[PDB]
Design an enzyme around this catalytic site. Structure first.
Site, PDB file in Angstrom:
ATOM      1  N   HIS A   1       3.502  -2.232   3.307  1.00 58.44           N
ATOM      2  CA  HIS A   1       3.468  -0.849   2.845  1.00 58.44           C
ATOM      3  C   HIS A   1       4.741  -0.433   2.114  1.00 58.44           C
ATOM      4  CE1 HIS A   1       0.303  -0.802   5.979  1.00 58.44           C
ATOM      5  NE2 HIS A   1      -0.252   0.125   5.218  1.00 58.44           N
TER       6      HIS A   1
ATOM      7  N   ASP B   1       0.797  -1.226   0.000  1.00 60.42           N
ATOM      8  CA  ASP B   1       0.000   0.000   0.000  1.00 60.42           C
ATOM      9  C   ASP B   1       0.832   1.279   0.000  1.00 60.42           C
ATOM     10  OD1 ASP B   1      -2.264  -1.520  -0.010  1.00 60.42           O
ATOM     11  OD2 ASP B   1      -3.030  -0.812   1.924  1.00 60.42           O
ATOM     12  N   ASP B   2       0.228   2.349  -0.520  1.00 63.83           N
ATOM     13  CA  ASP B   2       0.718   3.733  -0.408  1.00 63.83           C
ATOM     14  C   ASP B   2       1.802   4.152  -1.401  1.00 63.83           C
ATOM     15  OD1 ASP B   2      -1.121   3.759   1.627  1.00 63.83           O
ATOM     16  OD2 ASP B   2       0.370   3.754   3.244  1.00 63.83           O
TER      17      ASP B   2
ATOM     18  N   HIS C   1      -5.398   9.523   0.231  1.00 65.98           N
ATOM     19  CA  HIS C   1      -5.495   8.678   1.420  1.00 65.98           C
ATOM     20  C   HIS C   1      -6.388   9.241   2.537  1.00 65.98           C
ATOM     21  CE1 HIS C   1      -3.957   5.932   4.613  1.00 65.98           C
ATOM     22  NE2 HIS C   1      -3.695   5.143   3.586  1.00 65.98           N
TER      23      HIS C   1
ATOM     24  N   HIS D   1      -5.841   3.066  -4.670  1.00 70.23           N
ATOM     25  CA  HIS D   1      -5.808   3.288  -3.224  1.00 70.23           C
ATOM     26  C   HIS D   1      -6.286   4.691  -2.833  1.00 70.23           C
ATOM     27  CE1 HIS D   1      -4.888   1.728   0.651  1.00 70.23           C
ATOM     28  NE2 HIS D   1      -3.904   2.568   0.916  1.00 70.23           N
TER      29      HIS D   1
END
Length: 214
Positions: free
Chosen positions: A173, A28-29, A83, A79
């Site tokens: 991540h 993620d991210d 965020h 995603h």
């Protein structure tokens, strides 16, 4: 908040088929300058593909790394753009977050990603309903490495190996500025140790038997 009944009503899952010797690595991210390239190198040297849930804003800063992910056989997921906690936004903002990110990733990767993962795992039913209607699939996770806490490679490895099963979706991540070196190093242990138990690594569209594009 009834995440259980949502897997029966919408395109929504935490993990995959129990009768396949397959697990899925997800990150993620991304993208970022440090961790994403390192992860790609380690995935390469272990002959595995993974799934990357990229932030729209980070894809703008490092567009070429988004291209590298796609060029190396990995699958890209949406995603959101910046965020936010989707449980706190209205439908217009939610849809804007997804669509803006979709456009960015489509331009860079060459396809509109079918897979969405909500920031902190927070999603509302109407948001999930809209995504299902728009031919998205939302996938959470079932194994959390909590790697953002800066925990060591051994801690992450023991965690993953202790909680992974056929169908497991693992969460790691590649956040810019994150404390994630141990998370990267963990891959050198996680991958062969799971393979020894008969596990094979797959992408989400493979695990859920659908296309990577919407």
């Amino acid at each position: 908040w009834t995440p259980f009944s949502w897997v029966e009503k919408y395109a929504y899952a935490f993990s995959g088929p129990y009768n396949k010797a397959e697990v899925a690595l997800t990150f993620d991210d991304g993208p970022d300058l440090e961790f994403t390239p390192k992860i790609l190198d380690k995935l390469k040297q272990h002959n595995v593909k993974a799934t990357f849930f990229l932030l729209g804003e980070n894809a703008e800063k490092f567009p070429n790394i988004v291209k590298r992910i796609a060029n190396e056989g990995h699958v890209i997921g949406n995603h959101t753009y910046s965020h936010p906690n989707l449980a706190k936004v209205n439908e217009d903002e939610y849809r804007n977050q997804i669509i803006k990110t979709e456009e960015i990733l489509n331009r860079l990767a060459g396809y509109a990603p079918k897979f969405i993962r909500p920031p902190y795992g927070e999603i509302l039913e109407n948001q999930l309903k809209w995504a299902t209607e728009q031919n998205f699939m939302i996938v959470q996770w079932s194994v959390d490495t909590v790697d953002w806490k800066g925990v060591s490679a051994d801690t992450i490895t023991n965690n993953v190996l202790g909680n992974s099963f056929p169908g497991s979706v693992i969460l790691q991540h590649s956040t810019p500025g994150g404390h994630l070196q141990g998370s990267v190093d963990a891959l050198d242990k996680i991958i062969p140790q799971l393979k020894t138990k008969g596990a094979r690594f797959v992408t989400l569209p493979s695990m859920f038997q659908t296309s990577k594009e919407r």
